[PDB]
Design a protein around this ligand. Structure first.
Ligand SMILES: [Ca+2]
Length: 236
């Protein structure tokens, strides 16, 4: 069976409890965070240490923003059920382009050549960053069972991390095979794993990796904190 990998909390940082997190990434010392509601949706540039909003953009109405990723000088964002995505200039957070895709947009991340998109199914789409056209896919499995409902992604050291909200776990995925190589069980950080929870409640929904300093951050909808966590090496 798939092993469970340990972790430790390095540091807790403040997080704004108005942030209904829909995606997160880190770039050049700041966090960028999507916040989801069809009735007010935003992309925020956030100071890590203080949790304060430095800059924000409103998602084009009537859409609800979903996952986000940086690519070069751009910020690319999905929408939940609008079929529509947006590209912003990163520096000014002003919208510059739009694109359309089949299905629901849940989460995005990127490696050095491609974007990776979750749509709630077990098949992650690999996209060309400039055209947004689909050029490949990864079928994700854990011990052979399809794994769907992946509400956040983050690329970390050649692997894809994906949150599985209904089990409170992050899957570390080998992108070459699509196989889950380990679970990380973050139930300890979820504000209340004990109650009846839907995907709109205080679920983990932001995973961001600072590759320059090898820092992994996690937060979620209305969480009071953002955590830097260090994964414990697995044996074998
Ligand atoms: Ca992310």
């Amino acid at each position: 069976p798939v092993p469970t990998q340990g972790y430790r909390v390095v540091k807790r940082y403040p997080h704004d409890t108005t942030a209904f997190t829909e995606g997160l990434f880190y770039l050049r010392g700041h966090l960028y965070e999507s916040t989801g509601e069809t009735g007010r949706s935003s992309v925020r540039k956030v100071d890590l240490e203080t949790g304060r909003i430095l800059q924000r953009a409103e998602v084009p109405p009537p859409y609800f923003g979903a996952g986000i990723v940086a690519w070069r000088d751009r910020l690319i964002q999905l929408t939940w059920r609008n079929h529509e995505g947006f590209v912003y200039d990163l520096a000014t957070l002003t919208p510059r382009a739009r694109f359309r895709y089949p299905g629901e947009g849940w989460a995005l991340t990127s490696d050095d050549s491609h974007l990776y998109m979750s749509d709630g199914t077990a098949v992650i789409r690999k996209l060309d960053p400039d055209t947004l056209q689909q050029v490949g896919s990864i079928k994700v499995t854990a011990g052979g069972r399809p794994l769907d409902n992946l509400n956040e992604l983050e690329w970390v050291n050649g692997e894809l991390l994906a949150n599985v909200w209904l089990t409170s776990r992050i899957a570390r995925i080998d992108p070459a095979s699509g196989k889950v190589v380990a679970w990380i069980d973050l139930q300890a950080l979820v504000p209340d794993a004990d109650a009846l929870t839907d995907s709109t409640n205080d679920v983990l929904n932001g995973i961001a990796f600072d590759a320059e300093h090898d820092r992994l951050f996690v937060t979620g909808k209305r969480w009071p904190m953002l955590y830097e966590i260090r994964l414990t090496p697995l044996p074998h």
